[PDB]
Design a protein around this ligand. Sequence first.
Ligand SMILES: NC(=O)c1[nH]c2ccc(Cl)cc2c1-c1ccccc1
Ligand SMILES: [Mn+2]
Ligand SMILES: [Mn+2]
Length: 366
Amino acid sequence: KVQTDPPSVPICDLYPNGVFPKGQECEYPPTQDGRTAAWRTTSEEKKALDQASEEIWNDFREAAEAHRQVRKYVMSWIKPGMTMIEICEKLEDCSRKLIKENGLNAGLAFPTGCSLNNCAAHYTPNAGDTTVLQYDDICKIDFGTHISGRIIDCAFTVTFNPKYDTLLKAVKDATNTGIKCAGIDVRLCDVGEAIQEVMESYEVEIDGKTYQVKPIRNLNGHSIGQYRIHAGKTVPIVKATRMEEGEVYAIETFGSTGKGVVHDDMECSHYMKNFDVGHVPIRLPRTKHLLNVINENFGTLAFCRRWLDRLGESKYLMALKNLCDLGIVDPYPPLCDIKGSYTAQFEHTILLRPTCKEVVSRGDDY
Ligand SMILES: NC(=O)c1[nH]c2ccc(Cl)cc2c1-c1ccccc1
Ligand SMILES: [Mn+2]
Ligand SMILES: [Mn+2]
């Protein structure tokens, strides 16, 4: 069984024994004292603790292989002229097939971000959105896959105009720096300081205007937990907490030609149940029904309004507002820098395994 073009064969069909390709394996960086952390690669104790979690790493790898094949497919057809809805539906249809969607056991970890220009994150079109991808747009494709709640959070920036090439290079270099400097016992702020230094070393010229690339200071990388996109630890992308063994990180950076600060803008499309909210009894019929739809289909995973529409749900906006007002569900509105500014993003999921650092979502693309 080999992959077709367009991809349609599930990843678990391409690897019947359920052993999926490893990501990029990295030796841990040397500590601030000068001593190498290379011993972990050959430590018999660390090798044992690593094989104990083999099923876990293996679920991330399946989800990461689905991510590589879905993004390679998107890159071959994403073009100006397409509506944002068309782009998201074509990507998600492929993602559902390759991950072999199965309720909460395999599926889409979160909505397809396709944030444009000054908007950096958390924009996906709602029903009726007529936005069309333009030749001069700088589009952030940020989509997720999961196997048993082992989430792949991985993203890249799409452009058609070479005027953004050095802005893309700056952010790609900064993400790769963040990835290189991450490791067991490394302070989160040290990863952030390294990201910022690389980012700000770049100057770009776009349409006769020049800018020094700014990291978006209120956007950050994060630890990932089972069915939990943000497990609680923050990886700043600017200058106390340490990364720990067995942890999973989304290393992401955003570079901007604006203020380097995002604000809540436009209408909301992304929502997610607050992970720490227990069972809340609801009597309001439409609100009760919507929370049941959310619990059954998404659990603590992020969703968007288009995903409620595809489930046959209608007249749910007040119900959704009630869930947000009760603090059961949190809205995640688009995050945008100033009008006329340009933002780019690159993101990978990394596994802090006992033996090595695995950039599980690494591809031959980025
Ligand atoms: N951490 C993320 O990269 C992330 N990705 C998402 C996708 C959809 C939704 Cl609804 C939320 C997120 C979040 C996030 C952001 C800050 C606090 C908690 C989660
Ligand atoms: Mn992401
Ligand atoms: Mn993320």
